[PDB]
PDB file of C-alpha atoms in Angstrom:
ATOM      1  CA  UNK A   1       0.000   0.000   0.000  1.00 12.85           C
ATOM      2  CA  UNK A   2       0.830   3.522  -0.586  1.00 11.74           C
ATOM      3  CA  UNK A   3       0.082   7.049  -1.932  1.00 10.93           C
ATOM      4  CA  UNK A   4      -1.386   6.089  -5.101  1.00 10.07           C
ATOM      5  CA  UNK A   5      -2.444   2.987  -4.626  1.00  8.74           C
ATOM      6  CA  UNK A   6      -6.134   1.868  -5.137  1.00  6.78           C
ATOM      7  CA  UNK A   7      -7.728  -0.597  -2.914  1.00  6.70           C
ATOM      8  CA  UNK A   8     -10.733  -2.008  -2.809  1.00  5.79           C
ATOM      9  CA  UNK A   9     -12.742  -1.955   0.468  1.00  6.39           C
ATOM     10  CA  UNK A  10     -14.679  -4.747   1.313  1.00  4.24           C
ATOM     11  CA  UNK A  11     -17.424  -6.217   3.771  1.00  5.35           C
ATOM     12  CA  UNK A  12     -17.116  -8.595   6.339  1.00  3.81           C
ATOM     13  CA  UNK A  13     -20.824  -9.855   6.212  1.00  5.98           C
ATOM     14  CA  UNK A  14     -20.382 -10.968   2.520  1.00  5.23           C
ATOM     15  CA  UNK A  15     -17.449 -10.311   0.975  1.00  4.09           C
ATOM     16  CA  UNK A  16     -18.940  -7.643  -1.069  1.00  3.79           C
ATOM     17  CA  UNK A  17     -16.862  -5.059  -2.800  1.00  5.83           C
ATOM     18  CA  UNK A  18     -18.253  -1.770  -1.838  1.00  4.96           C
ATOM     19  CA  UNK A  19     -16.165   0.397  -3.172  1.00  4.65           C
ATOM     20  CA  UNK A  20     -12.176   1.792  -4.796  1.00  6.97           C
ATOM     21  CA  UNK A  21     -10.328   3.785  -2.478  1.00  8.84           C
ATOM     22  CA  UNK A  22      -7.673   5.940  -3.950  1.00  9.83           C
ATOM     23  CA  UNK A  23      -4.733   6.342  -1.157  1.00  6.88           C
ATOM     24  CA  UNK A  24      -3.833  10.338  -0.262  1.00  5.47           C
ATOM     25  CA  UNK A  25      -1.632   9.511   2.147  1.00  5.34           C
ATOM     26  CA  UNK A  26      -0.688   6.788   4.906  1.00  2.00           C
ATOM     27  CA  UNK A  27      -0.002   8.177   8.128  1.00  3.49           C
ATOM     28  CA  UNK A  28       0.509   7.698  11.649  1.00  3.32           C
ATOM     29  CA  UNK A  29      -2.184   9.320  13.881  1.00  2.42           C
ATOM     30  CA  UNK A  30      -1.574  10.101  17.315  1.00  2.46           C
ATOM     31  CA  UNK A  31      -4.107   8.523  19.634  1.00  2.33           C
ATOM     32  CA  UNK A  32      -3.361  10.116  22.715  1.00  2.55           C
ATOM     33  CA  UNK A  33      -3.898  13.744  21.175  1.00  5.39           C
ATOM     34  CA  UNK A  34      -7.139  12.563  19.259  1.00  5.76           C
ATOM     35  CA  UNK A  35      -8.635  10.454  22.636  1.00  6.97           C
ATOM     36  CA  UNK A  36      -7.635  13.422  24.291  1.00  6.08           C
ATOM     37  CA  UNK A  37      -9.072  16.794  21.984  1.00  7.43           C
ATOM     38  CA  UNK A  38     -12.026  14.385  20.669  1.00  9.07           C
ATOM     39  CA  UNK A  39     -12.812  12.371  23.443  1.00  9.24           C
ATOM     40  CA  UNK A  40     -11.810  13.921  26.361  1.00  8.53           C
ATOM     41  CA  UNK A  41      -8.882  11.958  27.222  1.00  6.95           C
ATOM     42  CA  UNK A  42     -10.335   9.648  29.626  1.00  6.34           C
ATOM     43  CA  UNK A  43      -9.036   6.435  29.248  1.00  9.78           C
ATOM     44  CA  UNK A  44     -12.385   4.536  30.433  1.00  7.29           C
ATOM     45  CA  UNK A  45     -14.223   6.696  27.926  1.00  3.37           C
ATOM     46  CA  UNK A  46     -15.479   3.841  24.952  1.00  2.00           C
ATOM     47  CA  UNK A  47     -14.277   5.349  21.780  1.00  2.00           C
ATOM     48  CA  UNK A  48     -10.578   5.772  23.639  1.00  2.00           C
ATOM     49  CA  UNK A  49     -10.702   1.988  24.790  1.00  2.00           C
ATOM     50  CA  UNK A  50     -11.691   1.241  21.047  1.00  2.00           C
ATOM     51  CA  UNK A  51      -9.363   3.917  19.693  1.00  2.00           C
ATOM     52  CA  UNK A  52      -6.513   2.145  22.219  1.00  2.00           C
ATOM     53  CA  UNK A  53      -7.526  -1.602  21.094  1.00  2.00           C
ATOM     54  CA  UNK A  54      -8.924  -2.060  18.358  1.00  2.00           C
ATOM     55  CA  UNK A  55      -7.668   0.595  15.983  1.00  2.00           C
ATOM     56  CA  UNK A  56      -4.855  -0.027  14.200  1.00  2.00           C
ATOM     57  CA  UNK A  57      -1.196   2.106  13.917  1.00  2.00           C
ATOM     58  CA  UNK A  58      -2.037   4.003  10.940  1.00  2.00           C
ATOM     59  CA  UNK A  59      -4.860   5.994   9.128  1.00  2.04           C
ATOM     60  CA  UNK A  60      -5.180   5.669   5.108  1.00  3.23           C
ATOM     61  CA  UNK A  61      -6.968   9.315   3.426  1.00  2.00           C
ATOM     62  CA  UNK A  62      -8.184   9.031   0.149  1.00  2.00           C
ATOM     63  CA  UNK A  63     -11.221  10.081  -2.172  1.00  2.00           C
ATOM     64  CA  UNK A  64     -13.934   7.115  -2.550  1.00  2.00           C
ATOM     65  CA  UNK A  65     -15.516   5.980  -5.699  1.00  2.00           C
ATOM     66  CA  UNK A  66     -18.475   3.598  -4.798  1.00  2.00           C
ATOM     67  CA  UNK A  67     -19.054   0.608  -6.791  1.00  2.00           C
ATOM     68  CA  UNK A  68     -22.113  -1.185  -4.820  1.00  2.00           C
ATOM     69  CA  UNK A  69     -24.058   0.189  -1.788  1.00  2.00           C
ATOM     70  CA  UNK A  70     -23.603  -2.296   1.689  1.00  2.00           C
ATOM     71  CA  UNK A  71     -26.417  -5.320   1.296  1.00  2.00           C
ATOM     72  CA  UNK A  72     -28.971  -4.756   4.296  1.00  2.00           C
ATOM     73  CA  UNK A  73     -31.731  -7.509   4.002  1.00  2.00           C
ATOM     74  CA  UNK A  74     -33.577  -5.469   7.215  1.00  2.00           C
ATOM     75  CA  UNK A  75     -36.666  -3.354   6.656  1.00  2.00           C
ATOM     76  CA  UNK A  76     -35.350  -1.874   3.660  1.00  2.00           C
ATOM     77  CA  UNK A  77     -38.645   0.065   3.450  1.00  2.00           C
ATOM     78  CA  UNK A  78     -37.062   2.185   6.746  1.00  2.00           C
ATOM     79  CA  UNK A  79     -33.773   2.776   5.387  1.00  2.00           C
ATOM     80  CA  UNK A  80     -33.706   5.718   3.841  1.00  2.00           C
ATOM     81  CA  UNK A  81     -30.700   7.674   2.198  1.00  2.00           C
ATOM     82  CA  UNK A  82     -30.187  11.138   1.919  1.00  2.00           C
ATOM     83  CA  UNK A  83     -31.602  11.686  -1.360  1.00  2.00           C
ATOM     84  CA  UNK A  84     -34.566   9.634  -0.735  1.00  2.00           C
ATOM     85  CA  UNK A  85     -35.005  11.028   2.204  1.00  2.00           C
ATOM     86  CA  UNK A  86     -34.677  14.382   0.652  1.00  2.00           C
ATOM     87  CA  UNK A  87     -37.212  13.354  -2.435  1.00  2.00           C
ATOM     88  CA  UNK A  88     -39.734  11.888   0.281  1.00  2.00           C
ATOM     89  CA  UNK A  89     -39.962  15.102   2.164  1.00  2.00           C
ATOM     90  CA  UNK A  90     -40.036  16.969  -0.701  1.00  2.00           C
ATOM     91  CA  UNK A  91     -42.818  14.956  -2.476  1.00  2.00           C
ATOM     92  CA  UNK A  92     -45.323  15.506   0.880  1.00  2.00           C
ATOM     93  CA  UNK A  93     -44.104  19.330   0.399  1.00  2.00           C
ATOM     94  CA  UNK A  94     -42.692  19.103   3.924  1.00  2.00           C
ATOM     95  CA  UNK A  95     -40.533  22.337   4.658  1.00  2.00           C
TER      96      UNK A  95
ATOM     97  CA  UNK B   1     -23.045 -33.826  -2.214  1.00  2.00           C
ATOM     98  CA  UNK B   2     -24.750 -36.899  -1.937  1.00  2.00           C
ATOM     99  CA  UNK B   3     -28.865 -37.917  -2.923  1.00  2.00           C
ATOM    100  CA  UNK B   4     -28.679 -40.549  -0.600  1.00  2.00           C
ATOM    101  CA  UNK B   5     -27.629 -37.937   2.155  1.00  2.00           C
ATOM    102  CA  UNK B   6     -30.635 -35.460   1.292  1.00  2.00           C
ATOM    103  CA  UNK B   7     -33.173 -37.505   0.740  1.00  2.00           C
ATOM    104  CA  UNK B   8     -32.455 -38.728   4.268  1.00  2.00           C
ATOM    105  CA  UNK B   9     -32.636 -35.186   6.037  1.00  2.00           C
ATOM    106  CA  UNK B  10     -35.794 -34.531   3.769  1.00  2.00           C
ATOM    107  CA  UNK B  11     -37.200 -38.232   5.365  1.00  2.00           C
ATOM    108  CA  UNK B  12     -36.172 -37.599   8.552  1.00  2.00           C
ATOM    109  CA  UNK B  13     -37.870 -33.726   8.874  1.00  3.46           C
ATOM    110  CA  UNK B  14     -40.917 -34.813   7.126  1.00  5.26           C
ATOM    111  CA  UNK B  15     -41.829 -36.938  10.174  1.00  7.47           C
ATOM    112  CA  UNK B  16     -42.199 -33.696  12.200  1.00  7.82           C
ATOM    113  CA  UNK B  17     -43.022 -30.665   8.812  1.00  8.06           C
ATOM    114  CA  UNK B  18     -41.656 -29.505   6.195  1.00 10.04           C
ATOM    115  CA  UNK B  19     -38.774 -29.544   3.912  1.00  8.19           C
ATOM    116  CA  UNK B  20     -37.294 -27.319   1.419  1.00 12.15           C
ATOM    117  CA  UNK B  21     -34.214 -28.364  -0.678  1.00 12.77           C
ATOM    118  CA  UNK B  22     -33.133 -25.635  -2.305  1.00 10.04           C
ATOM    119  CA  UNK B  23     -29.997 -25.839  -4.908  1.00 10.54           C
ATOM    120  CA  UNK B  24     -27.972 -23.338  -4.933  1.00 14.24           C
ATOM    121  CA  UNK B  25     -26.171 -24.227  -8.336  1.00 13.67           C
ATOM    122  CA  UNK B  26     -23.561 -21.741  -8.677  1.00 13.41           C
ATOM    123  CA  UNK B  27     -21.344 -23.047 -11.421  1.00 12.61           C
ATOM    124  CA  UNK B  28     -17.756 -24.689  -9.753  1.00 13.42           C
ATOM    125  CA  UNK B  29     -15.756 -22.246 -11.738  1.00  9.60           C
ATOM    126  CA  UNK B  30     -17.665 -18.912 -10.515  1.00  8.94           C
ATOM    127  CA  UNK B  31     -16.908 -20.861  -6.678  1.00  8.95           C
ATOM    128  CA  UNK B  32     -13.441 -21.177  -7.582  1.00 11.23           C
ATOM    129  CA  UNK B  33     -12.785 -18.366  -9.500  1.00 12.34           C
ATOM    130  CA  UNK B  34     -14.279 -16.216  -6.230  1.00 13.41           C
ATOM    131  CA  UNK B  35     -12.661 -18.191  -3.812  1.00 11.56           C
ATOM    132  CA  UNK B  36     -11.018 -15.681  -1.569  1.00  9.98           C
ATOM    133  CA  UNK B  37      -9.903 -18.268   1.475  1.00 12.38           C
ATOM    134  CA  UNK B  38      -8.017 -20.430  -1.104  1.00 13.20           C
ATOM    135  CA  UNK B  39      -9.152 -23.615  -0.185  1.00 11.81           C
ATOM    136  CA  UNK B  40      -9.796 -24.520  -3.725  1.00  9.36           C
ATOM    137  CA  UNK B  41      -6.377 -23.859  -4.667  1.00  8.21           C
ATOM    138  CA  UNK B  42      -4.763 -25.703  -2.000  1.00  9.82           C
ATOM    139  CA  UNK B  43      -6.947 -28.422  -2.927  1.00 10.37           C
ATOM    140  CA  UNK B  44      -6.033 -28.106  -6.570  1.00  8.82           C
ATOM    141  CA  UNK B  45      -2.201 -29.025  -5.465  1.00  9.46           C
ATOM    142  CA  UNK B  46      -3.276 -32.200  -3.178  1.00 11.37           C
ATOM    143  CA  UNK B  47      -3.180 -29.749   0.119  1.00  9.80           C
ATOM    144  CA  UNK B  48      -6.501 -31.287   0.832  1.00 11.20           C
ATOM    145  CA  UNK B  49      -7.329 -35.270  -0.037  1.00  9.75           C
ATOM    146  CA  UNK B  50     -10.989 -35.329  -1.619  1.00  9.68           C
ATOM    147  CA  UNK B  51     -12.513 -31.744  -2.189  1.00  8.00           C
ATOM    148  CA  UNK B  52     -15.842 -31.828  -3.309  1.00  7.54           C
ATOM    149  CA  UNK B  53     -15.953 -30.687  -7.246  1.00  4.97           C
ATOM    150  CA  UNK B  54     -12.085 -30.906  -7.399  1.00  3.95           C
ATOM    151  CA  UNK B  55     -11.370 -35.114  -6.637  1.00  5.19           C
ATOM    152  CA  UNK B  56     -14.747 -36.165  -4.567  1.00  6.92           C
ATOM    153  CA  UNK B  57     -18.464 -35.785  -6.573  1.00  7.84           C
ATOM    154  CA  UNK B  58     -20.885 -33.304  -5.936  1.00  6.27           C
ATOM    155  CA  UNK B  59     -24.805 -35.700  -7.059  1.00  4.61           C
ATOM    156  CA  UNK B  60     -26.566 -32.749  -8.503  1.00  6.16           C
ATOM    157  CA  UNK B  61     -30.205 -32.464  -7.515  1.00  5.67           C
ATOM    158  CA  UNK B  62     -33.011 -33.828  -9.413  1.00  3.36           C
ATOM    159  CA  UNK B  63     -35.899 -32.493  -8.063  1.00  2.00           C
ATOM    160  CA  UNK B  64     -34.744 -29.528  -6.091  1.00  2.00           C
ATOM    161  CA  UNK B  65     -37.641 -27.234  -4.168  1.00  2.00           C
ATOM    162  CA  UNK B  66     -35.943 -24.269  -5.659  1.00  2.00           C
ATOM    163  CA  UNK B  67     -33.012 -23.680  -7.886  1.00  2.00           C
ATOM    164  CA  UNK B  68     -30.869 -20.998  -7.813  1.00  2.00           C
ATOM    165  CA  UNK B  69     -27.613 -19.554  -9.643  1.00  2.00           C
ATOM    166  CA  UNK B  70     -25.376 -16.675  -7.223  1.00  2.00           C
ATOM    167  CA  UNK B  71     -23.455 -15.608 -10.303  1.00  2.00           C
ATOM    168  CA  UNK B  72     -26.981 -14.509 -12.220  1.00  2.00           C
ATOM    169  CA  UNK B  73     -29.430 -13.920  -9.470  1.00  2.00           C
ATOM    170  CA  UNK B  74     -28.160 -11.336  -6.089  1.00  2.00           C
ATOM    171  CA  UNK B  75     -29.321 -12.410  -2.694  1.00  2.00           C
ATOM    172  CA  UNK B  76     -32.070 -10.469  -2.172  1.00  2.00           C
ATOM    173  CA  UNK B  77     -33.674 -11.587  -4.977  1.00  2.00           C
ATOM    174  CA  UNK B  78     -32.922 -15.060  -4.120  1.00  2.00           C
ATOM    175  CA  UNK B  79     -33.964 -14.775  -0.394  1.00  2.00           C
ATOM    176  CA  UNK B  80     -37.040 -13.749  -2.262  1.00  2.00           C
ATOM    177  CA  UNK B  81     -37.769 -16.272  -4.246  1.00  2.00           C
ATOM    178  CA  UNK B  82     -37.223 -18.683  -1.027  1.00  2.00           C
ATOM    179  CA  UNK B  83     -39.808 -16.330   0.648  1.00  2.00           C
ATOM    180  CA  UNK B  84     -42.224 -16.735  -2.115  1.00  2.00           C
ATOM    181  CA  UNK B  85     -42.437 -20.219  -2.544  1.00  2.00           C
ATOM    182  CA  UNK B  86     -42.827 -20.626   1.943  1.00  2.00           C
ATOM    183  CA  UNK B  87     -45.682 -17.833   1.313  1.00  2.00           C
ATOM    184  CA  UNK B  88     -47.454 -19.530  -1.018  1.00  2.00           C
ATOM    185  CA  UNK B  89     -47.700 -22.500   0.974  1.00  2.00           C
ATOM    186  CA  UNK B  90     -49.402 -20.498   3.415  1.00  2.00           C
ATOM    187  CA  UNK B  91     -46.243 -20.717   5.733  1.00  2.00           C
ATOM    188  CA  UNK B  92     -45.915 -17.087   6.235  1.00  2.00           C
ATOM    189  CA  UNK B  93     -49.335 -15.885   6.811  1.00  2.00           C
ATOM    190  CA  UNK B  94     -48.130 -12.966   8.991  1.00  2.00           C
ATOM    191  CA  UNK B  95     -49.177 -11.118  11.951  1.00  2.00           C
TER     192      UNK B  95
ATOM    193  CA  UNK C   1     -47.174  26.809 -36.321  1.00  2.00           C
ATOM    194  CA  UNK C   2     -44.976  24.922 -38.922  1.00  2.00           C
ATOM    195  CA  UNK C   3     -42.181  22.081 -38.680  1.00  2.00           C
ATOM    196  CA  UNK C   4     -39.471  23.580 -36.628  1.00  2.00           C
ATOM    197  CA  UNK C   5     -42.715  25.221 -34.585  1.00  2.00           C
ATOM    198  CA  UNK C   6     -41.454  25.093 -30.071  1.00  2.00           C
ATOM    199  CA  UNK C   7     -44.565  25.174 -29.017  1.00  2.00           C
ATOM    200  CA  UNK C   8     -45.172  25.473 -25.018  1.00  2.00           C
ATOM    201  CA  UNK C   9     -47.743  22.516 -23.791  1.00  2.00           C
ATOM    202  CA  UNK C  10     -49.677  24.166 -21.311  1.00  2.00           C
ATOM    203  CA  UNK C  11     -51.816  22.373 -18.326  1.00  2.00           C
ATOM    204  CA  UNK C  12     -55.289  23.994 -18.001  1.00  2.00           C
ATOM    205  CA  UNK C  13     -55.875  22.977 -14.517  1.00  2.00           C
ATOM    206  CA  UNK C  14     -53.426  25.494 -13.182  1.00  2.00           C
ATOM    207  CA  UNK C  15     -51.691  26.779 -16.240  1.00  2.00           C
ATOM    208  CA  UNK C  16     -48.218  25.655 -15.901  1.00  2.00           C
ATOM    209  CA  UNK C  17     -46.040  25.315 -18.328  1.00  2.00           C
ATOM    210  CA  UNK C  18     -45.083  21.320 -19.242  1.00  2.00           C
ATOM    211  CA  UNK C  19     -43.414  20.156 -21.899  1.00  2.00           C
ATOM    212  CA  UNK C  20     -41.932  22.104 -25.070  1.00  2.00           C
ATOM    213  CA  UNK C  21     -42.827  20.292 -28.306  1.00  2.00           C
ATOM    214  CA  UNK C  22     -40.738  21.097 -31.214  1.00  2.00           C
ATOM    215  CA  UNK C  23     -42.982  20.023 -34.369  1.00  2.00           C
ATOM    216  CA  UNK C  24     -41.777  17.450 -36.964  1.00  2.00           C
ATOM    217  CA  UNK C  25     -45.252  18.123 -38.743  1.00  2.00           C
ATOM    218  CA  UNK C  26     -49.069  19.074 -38.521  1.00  2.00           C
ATOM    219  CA  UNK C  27     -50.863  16.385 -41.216  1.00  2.00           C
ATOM    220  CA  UNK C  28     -54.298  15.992 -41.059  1.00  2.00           C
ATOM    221  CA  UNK C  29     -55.769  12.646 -39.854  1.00  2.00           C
ATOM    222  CA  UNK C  30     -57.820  10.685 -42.188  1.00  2.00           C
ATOM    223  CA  UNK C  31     -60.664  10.022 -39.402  1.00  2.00           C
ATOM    224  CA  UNK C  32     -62.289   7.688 -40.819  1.00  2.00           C
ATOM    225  CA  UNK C  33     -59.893   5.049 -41.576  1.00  2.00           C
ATOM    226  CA  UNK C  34     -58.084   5.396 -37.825  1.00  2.00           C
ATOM    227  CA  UNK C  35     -61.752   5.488 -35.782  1.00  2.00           C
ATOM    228  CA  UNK C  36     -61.983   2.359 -38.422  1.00  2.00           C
ATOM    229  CA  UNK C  37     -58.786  -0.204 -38.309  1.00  2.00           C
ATOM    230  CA  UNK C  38     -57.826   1.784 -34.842  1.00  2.00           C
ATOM    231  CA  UNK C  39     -60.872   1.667 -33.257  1.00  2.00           C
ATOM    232  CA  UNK C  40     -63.194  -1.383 -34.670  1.00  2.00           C
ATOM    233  CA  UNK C  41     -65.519   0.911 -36.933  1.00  2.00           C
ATOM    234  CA  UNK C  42     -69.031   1.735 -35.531  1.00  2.00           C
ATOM    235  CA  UNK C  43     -70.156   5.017 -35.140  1.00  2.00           C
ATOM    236  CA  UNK C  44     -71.552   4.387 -31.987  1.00  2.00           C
ATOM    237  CA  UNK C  45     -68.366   3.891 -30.310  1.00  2.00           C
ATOM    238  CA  UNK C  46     -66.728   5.801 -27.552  1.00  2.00           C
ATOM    239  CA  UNK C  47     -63.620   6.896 -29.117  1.00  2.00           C
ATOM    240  CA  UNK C  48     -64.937   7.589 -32.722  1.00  2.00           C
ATOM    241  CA  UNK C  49     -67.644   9.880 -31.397  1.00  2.00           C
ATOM    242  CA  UNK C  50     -64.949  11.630 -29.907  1.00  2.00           C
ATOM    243  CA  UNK C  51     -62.449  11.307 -32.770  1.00  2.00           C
ATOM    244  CA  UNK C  52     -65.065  13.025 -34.947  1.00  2.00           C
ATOM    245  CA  UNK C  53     -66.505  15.674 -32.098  1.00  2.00           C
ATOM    246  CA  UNK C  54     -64.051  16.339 -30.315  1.00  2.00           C
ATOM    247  CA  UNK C  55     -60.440  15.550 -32.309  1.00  2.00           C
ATOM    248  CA  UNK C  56     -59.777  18.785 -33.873  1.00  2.00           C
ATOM    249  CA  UNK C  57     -58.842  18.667 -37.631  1.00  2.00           C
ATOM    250  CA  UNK C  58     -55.549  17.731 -37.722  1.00  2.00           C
ATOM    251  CA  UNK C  59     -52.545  16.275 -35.285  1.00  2.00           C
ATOM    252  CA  UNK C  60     -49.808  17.955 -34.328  1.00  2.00           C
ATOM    253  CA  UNK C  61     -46.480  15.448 -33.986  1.00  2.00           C
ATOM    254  CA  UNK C  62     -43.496  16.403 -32.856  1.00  2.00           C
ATOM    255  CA  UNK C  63     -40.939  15.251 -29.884  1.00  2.00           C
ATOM    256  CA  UNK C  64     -40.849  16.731 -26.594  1.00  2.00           C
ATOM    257  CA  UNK C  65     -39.203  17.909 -24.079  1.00  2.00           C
ATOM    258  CA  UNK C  66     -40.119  18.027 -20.072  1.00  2.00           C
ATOM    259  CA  UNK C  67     -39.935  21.133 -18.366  1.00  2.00           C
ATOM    260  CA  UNK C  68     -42.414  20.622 -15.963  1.00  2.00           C
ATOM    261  CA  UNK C  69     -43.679  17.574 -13.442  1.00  2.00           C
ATOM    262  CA  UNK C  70     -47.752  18.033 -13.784  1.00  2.00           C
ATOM    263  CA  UNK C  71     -49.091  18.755 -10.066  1.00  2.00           C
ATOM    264  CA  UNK C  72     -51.023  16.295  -8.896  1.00  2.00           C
ATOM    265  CA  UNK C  73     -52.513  17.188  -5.002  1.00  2.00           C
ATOM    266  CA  UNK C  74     -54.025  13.895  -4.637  1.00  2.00           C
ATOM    267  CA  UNK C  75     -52.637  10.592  -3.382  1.00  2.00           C
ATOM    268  CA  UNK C  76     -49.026  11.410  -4.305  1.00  2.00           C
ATOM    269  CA  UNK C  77     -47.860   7.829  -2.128  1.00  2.00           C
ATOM    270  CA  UNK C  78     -50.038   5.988  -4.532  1.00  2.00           C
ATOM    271  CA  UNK C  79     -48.751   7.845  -7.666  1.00  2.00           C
ATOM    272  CA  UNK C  80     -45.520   6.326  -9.014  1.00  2.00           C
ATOM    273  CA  UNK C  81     -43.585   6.901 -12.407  1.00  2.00           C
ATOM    274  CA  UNK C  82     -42.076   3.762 -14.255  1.00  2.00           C
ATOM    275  CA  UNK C  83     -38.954   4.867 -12.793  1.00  2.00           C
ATOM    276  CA  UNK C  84     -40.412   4.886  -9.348  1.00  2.00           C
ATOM    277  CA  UNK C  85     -41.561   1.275  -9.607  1.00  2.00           C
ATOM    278  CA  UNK C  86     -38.731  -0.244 -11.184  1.00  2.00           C
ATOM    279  CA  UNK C  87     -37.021   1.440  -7.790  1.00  2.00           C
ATOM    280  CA  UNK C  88     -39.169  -0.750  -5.701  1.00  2.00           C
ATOM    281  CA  UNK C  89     -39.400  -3.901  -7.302  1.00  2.00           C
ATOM    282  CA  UNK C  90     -35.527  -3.530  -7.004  1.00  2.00           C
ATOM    283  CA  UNK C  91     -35.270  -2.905  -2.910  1.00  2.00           C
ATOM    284  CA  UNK C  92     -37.383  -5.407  -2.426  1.00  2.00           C
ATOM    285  CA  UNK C  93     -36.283  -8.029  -4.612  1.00  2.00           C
ATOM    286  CA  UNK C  94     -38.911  -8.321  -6.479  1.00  2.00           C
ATOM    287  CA  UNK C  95     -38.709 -10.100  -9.354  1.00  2.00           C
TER     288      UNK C  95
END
């Protein structure tokens, strides 16, 4: 991996290819600061112990180009996404 | 892989309600080709005595519930089409 | 109003302004022979006693162009474009 490079990010449910990411840059975040300014900085706080344990030891930046949107096979009828959201309200003239 | 081995599960349910076989007949080649643990591979090269398709049989079904192909049909769809044959056998008639 | 003609197709329930249709030509219908082959014949019929009292002389053709939905105020959940459908038969795996 590196600047440049495209990868292709996939899901753990089903293997599913959701879409190219083109690498910016590779870098190595500092988790104290970001717990800390975030967060708050203490260490009990959830997103620190996940930011401490399960996060890994660097961050990869880069634009997104989708290719296929996550598979939910859960009252689709209830998820909506911006747009349709956007088209729904917009429909029943709701301002 | 074996007829003698489904028609006993579909025996041994009946006594107590129904069962569905349903095929999913995704070609061997699609499996291998998206084989992404490389099982088939290893396999392939003797890794693995016996793998079903690649040096043991696979008895395609005869008279299958429901067929169904994962390179030409997604899985909604084919959820679906499970759902619509159990609905039509007055399975599903919801709350 | 010749060929090359953009004419504006107006909506007299509220008079907004709907599609733009640039004419290709402005014929006159042989009445008799459509309300005949088209329509079955008899005079009686719904459509030829429209054709000839209503139908004006002759038909405008001519492709068009949208510029304007058509408000509808009235059971706008129930209302749905071929678009709109082919949308939901696709979330819900309908095939």
């Amino acid at each position: 991996l590196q600047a440049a490079s495209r990868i292709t990010l996939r899901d753990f449910r089903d293997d599913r290819n959701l879409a190219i990411l083109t690498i910016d840059d590779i870098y190595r975040p500092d988790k104290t600061k970001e717990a800390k300014l975030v967060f708050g900085g203490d260490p009990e706080h959830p997103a620190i112990v996940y930011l401490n344990n399960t996060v890994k030891e660097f961050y990869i930046g880069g634009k997104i180009e989708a290719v296929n949107k996550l598979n939910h096979y859960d009252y689709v009828a209830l998820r909506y996404t911006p747009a349709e959201l956007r088209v729904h309200f917009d429909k029943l003239g709701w301002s | 892989p074996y007829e003698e081995s489904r028609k006993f599960a579909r025996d041994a349910v009946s006594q107590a309600g129904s069962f569905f076989l349903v095929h999913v007949a995704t070609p061997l080649e699609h499996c291998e080709q998206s084989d992404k643990r490389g099982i088939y591979a290893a396999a392939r090269r003797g890794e693995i005595k016996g793998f079903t398709g690649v040096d043991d049989p696979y008895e395609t079904p005869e008279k299958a519930d429901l067929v169904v192909d994962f390179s030409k049909q997604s899985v909604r769809s084919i959820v679906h089409e499970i759902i619509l044959v159990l609905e039509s056998q007055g399975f599903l008639e919801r709350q």
